[PDB]
């Protein structure tokens, strides 16, 4: 009931006021708030079957000024804008893990499918079935969530003349460092544990997978049973969906073979064994690599020479080089990461090809993206996540400033001159070409005799004078970057081991000649589709650039999601949690964009006493700007009051309020002394003017 | 605008080039300019009057082989310009005006060499930026180290450069003019003891191939001479390009020993082990410990089987008996300098140390003496 | 200041003063009033004479005499200032000031007044049923006279 | 609010710091500021342009060692500020704005030294309170005594301070500029007699290590010189950081004898025994008895084996034959001053003798001359 | 029995000898021992297997030049014995067993050097008496003075000795190992910038001749570098012994500047002006006045035209602005030490300060440490 749909119209905009408004609306069982172009949603933990097909006709765009703020208004807004400007656009779903992003995606897909009266007839267009599969491949347990999206899910819904066509799915920012490394109290991607829990026996005797609890790629977390809510039933339903997608049993068997090969490669160790002139490397146990070779249809000596020897090959000769232990570990990790990435790309490509729509058609975009992260201790993955969120926050700030500018121009022409300060310096601090932090890290990757301390020292040197950089006082292995969401302190522990994604051409050549068809096809396709680099940061930056280009090809308009207390309590929340989520989402920056915004009727009404405005019903033509000068001698700096009413700036506003309360204090003192004078003058009449006459009568007769 | 910078290790006898960021040179061919000498009789086949390295390798029998680079210094400038033009256009098929280029040089080379190299590579090919780097620092870059003495021994020069934690000691740099080409000439002069005569340039390169495929360095010289002239176990046979079989005896290992005994050619200098020890003893004591512990090799002419063991034995005999000598002999002694140059040119922090065209145009060619080394 | 004086009420001031401040230190006693009124003599009675005074203002002095005469009420409580002060809490032209409004204004801001003072106002304030006190008649009667 | 006050004995050649109430200094490292001198060739390793004491110890071979404190007085103020910042942040990891600090000083040092020390430690580090204490009174505190003459002989100064029951005699304080650094320089100059040449700063510190590990003081000089040049029993060998073995003969004990015979360096002053005796004979007779009976030592340069016996013999030869001379040589001659400072800074009655920030701000830096000593 | 005592100034690179009482050395020749290295083919001309200085100068092309004296210390004793025998017999034609001999030495040389010198000159040549005198006191004798600092800079050592009215200050003697031979080596290393290669010993001596005949010291370095690389006015040409003409530019004056800037060779020491100023500031104030007023020079390597003016400018910039610096540059900087030795050996009061054969036989060689200096 309590609408306050547009908080721009209030006297002042503060995070406290916004939090109070959201609390009031949540207590009113209202989730969505229509902040002009932007929308805000909160996870209710409450199953709301809002209406049904009728809501499209009930919450259409014809009465946006009176319609309640709802998520499904954008469904009609998209069509209304594309039918007018003749330009497709994109919609992003952003928010921290567990904020109902998948629920919002399902709701918007249902609304778009239900608006054309055709989905009932062509429901065979098999679109959303694989969402749990891409979830199991792309989600993993974090210290704050048991289901966290760790990849930039992208679903493209195609349209042609109002007819909903097929869809194309893609991944952008998958973190490859999770497969080999994982922090404490977290674990790897969910599907490894699902496979190990739902493993049938025939795979147990055939594939050596009896060490499901002692794999190095999995035991790193220290506790893999915290996710005990998941079980082998997830594996069974995953297999049911996998068969639904038209995959033969051979494809599933090959996928399990590759996953088992990756898990076995996780359990490979090296020894600092002596050699001709140095101590380089030696494989501890050959039975494990032999078993890897048996189930991969590839020579074992190929793997030995690809993970132990470095191949420098020219036209006239090919030279083998012994490798150090760290280099061998990096090569093994690169092999595992590239195998996992190729599996994901293959599955995404096949899913897209199954329901591939027509080409050269219209298209609406849905983007599932990361959330801003600030843990107790932060690592490389958090840095990449923060960089991506910084780029998206830059885009959001651009959109907000565009809306402010168009509103200002809609009021009067001449306020397009108002400027705006962006977060470009932070983006340059992160990844500018000459001396960016990621560029320094990439240089340190290949630089000889490098360690974490040297990288930290170089970062400290090159960014000492940067206002956003913050050198720690104590000699600590940390640094602090000022993001838009606040200060974040990273730890430089193990960055150099999270970037050595070097895959020499000999490994790809070995995997092309594999006897199995799927692996050979995947590596041949990878070599055919392939300028590039050889670090995780560089690939992440390339994918981020591709995503930014795809977004700028269309018009960005999206929605943010917030989360109440993470104890799964419906209808109850902590205001501090709201403040934290509001800071992390980035909607707080709108207040900074406001910089002024105050009305005119307030001046009309409650600013007349100062000169004791003699006249009544003042119009807009009343001497107003000079009025302040005649009462405070302040030069005309308010943008313009007029009818176009967003003029009063913050510090002058507080000065005016202080002056008002001071005037009220003086008026109250005057009233008090006036009442005291009246009381004493009553006292004066009483004791003589109505008593002496009575006494005259008493003495009289 | 991503543009990979070319790395062109134009050594003294072989040109090794490629793009930065690779793991091996894209193109390897001898730096030879060939010109026909006989008279052409067939009308039409008298137009190709100059063959660059590999083509001149294929047609040795009807033309003369001239090396533009003699003992490090660039003698014939037109031939070197032809080689650069070939390796830019006909070999990599990459326009040089869109890619920065990196070049290597001996430590104690003349200055007019650098000035003319910069002038040619800025005026002719119009390269946006270029840089000249000493070969030893690139060898250390490729070896993945920061301390130790680099013994870079190409076929034109053999020089030592002591480096400790990135700070070079320029007063301990020693350079010898004894290199692989002089070994080839000694092999030509020492093969006449068995009757084989090699006089022309093609026969000189046949002798070079013999040296590459048969020569080795022994641990002890007197013992191996006695063994050679006490049996036929060390004799090996080689087949000339006309099916004529030659046999080599004690000449197999007496060709590369002149590196340790340069009195065979008559030079007054000392062997490479002695120069390395003297270069160490020109450095500070705290420097000397790590220089002892971290000897490294590079260059083609250090690929003889048994070089590392003998030079280790000689350094250990020279150095005090309580120190540990460990000589690094990676299997990429050839084109280790190119691997180091590729690593160096791929660094994003290196972008500010180029020589931009504006800098050269405003300050002249002398800045190559200021921004290098 | 006495330079500009409203002689209509100067007589009232002089009467009240000569009845309160006399040729003595400043203390006001029953003796002075009783003598000046009925010094001739009245037989004693106690019908309503067991409680006379309980709220004495304070001490009196000739210097304080002149200062208070000049400052307190001489030509004060201007009608325009009265309208201004009373309307500072009001936007209506008619001066409807809700009685509860003034209740919190007096008992919540500045130095606090008591509900007894509010009643004192109400016992003499003409207020409509809805509680919107007006003050035009207040000013009229205050300025007119006794 | 319990806050332990830091005690920072910034001596002339070594910085010994820690918290008050401990029994040994937390951090000990030389007070050296090192700066590289050669040219950097590796791109990236050219940023660390100043190494503080221990890091500069590790990298002697590529940089120059400069001592900010020369003969007690602070010469280079920026280097000393760098050393203080290092020992506060990178060594103890304790913010100096939350802990009071105690500093030591030679007795007869200049006054601008104290004024600038207070100004730096109040304006830069914003220490809440600081104090400057003479080293001899802290040595007496650490020795658990209240009478006797302190012979504090660091590597920058050697001074005597007679104290009797807590009342210092400021007219009997004697100070000599002959200390350990001059012994090291004499050892450098006297080692050339055998052919060993030490010129650089790193070689000077190698000589310092030799002095610490081999030198001793003999009871009789002529007898020991005859013994040394009559046999090889006193010869000892030392190993330089490159495995080169050196042999030392009569130079072993002729280095620390200049303390008793300062004419070797050419100084006109007298030995430490003579200065101690003259300082006693500047005191009252009743004072003189207890000063005779309670000689005490401190400072690093009094750790030579045999110093106590010889100085006892010399004082006994100087003093009247009927008095008892007893020289205290505790095994903590090094950082006895720090132990005394830690004892002094932990007293709860010392809380009122600090120099609070308000006092310095209202009266200026001159109060360091009023509240000290 | 009148017997003139021989004076044999056996310096580090040249031997200057003669009789006492003359005004110039009778014999001057380099101290080089040459040995052939090639193979003799003519039967009969294979007997002269060692050529002493001047003969080895005449036949540089077929033999190796080795200096027995390296940086002051006598390295090879047999070669030095051969040089002494030559300069006694084949050069002066005077039997050494009938004449006393005087020898010179660096100040801070090792002691075994003196002991072996005395042993050789008493046992082999059977000289009746000999004496070893420091070169600086002889330079002061030859200059006809009794005060001032001697800057004796040969080709093996450069040392300062402050003397005031005949009383030496042995604690202010400073010695540097930077001398003329290191200047020659720097010239060899700096001539490669123009393409001239000098590697052998004969080429090293050709470079030495170039240095003697062309090098000079400028007043200002930056101005002269700009002038050199702004015109061709400073370029001079030299003719090698085969008619090949070489041209020298800014290398003409950048060779002898390393005396004032010894960082070019990498030495951590300071220039000769700085060492002279520091040696003065190690002396007393009353001494300092006359040391300022009476600087004197000697040694060959101080003959560069313009050395006196620059060192005067540098001392004046270092010394206080009110004092008068007057540097004595007599035109006999070469063999001034020999003139002083001849004056000293001709004094009749010197007859009692020899080292007689009976003294050496009864007390052993150690008396050379007692009767010298
Ligand atoms: N395997 C080998 N064994 C012996 N010598 C070799 C070998 N390979 C190359 N060389 C010698 O190295 C010389 C040059 O090799 P390299 O150092 O690669 O080129 P550059 O000297 O131009 O850098 C050739 O003259 C050749 O004689
Ligand atoms: N065991 C030892 N034997 C001889 N000399 C020593 C010994 N330990 C230290 N020294 C000398 O003491 C000097 C300084 O020591 P110390 O007094 O602890 O520092 P500071 O002089 O700064 O107070 C050093 O120069 C060193 O030469
Ligand atoms: N005229 C000159 N100009 C420059 N240098 C000279 C000159 N004459 C001699 N020298 C240098 O002086 C060095 C030795 O000269 P000298 O002092 O006479 O002999 P010694 O050093 O043995 O006493 C030689 O190495 C030579 O380079
Ligand atoms: Mg090479």
Author numbering:
A (entry chain D): 1205 to 1734, 1749 to 1813, 1818 to 1923
B (entry chain B), D (entry chain A), E (entry chain C): 3 to 375
C (entry chain E): 22 to 167
Article passage:
The motor protein myosin-15 is necessary for the development and maintenance of mechanosensory stereocilia, and mutations in myosin-15 cause hereditary deafness. Unconventional myosin-15 (encoded by the Myo15a gene in mouse and MYO15A in humans) is a plus-end directed molecular motor essential for stereocilia development and maintenance. Here, we present cryo–electron microscopy structures of myosin-15 bound to F-actin, providing a framework for interpreting the impacts of deafness mutations on motor activity and actin nucleation. We propose myosin-15 enhances polymerization by bridging actin protomers, regulating nucleation efficiency by modulating actin’s structural plasticity in a myosin nucleotide state–dependent manner.
To more rigorously probe whether even a minor transition accompanying ADP release occurs, which might only be discernable in more distal regions of the lever arm, we once again implemented a symmetry expansion approach for the wild-type rigor and ADP-state actomyosin-15 complexes, this time recentering the particles on the myosin motor domain to facilitate alignments capturing the distal converter and lever arm regions. This produced reconstructions with substantially improved density in the nucleotide binding pocket and lever arm region. Biochemical analysis demonstrated that the first myosin-15 IQ motif binds the regulatory light chain (RLC) rather than the essential light chain (ELC), as is canonically found in myosin-2 (4, 56), the functional implications of which remain unclear. We next examined the nucleotide binding pockets of these two states, which were well resolved at the secondary structure level by the symmetry expansion and myosin-recentering procedure. Unexpectedly, other than the clear presence of nucleotide density in the ADP state and its absence in the rigor state, we observe no discernable rearrangements in the backbone positioning of the nucleotide binding loops upon ADP release, unlike myosin-1, myosin-5, or myosin-6 (21–23). While the limited resolution in this region of the maps does not rule out more subtle side-chain level repositioning, our data imply that any major rearrangements in myosin-15’s nucleotide binding pocket accompanying ATP hydrolysis must occur concomitant with phosphate release, before strong binding on F-actin. An essentially complete lack of coupling between ADP release and lever arm repositioning strongly suggests that this step of the mechanochemical cycle is unlikely to be meaningfully mechanically gated in myosin-15. Furthermore, our Mg-ADP–bound actomyosin-15 structure reveals minimal rearrangements in the motor domain and lever arm when compared to the rigor state, providing a structural rationale for myosin-15’s high actin-binding affinity in the presence of ADP and suggesting that, unlike other high-duty ratio motors, ADP release is unlikely to be mechanically gated in myosin-15.
